[PDB]
Amino acid sequence: TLVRPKPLLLKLLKSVGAQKDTYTMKEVLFYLGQYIMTKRLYDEKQQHIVYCSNDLLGDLFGVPSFSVKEHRKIYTMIYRNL
Structure with a gap:
């Protein structure tokens, strides 16, 4: 299943190496997690x-x-950017 990110999400994904305009959900999550890891947006002491x-x-x-434990909120925020 391929999904097509809205501009803002697309900018994010590309800023970490993605090049296409459509992705699997696994691919969106990987790049999103890479963006978070590279910029270190997580709390050092409560890493989720x-x-x-x-x-x-x-912004998006x-x-x-x-929290990375909030799977439903995270999908819902993603759907909204597809």
Whole structure:
């Protein structure tokens, strides 16, 4: 199943190496996780928490924090960017 990111998400994904305009959900997640890891947006002391305030990831997700344990919120924020 291929999905097509909206501009903002697309910019994010490419800024970490993706080149196509369509992806599998596994591919979106990988790049999203790479973006988070490379920029180190997570809390050092509570690593499942991401602080994405004042950042493209915050702009597209519409929140300045979330937790990687929140699978449903994370998919819903993704759907909204497809």
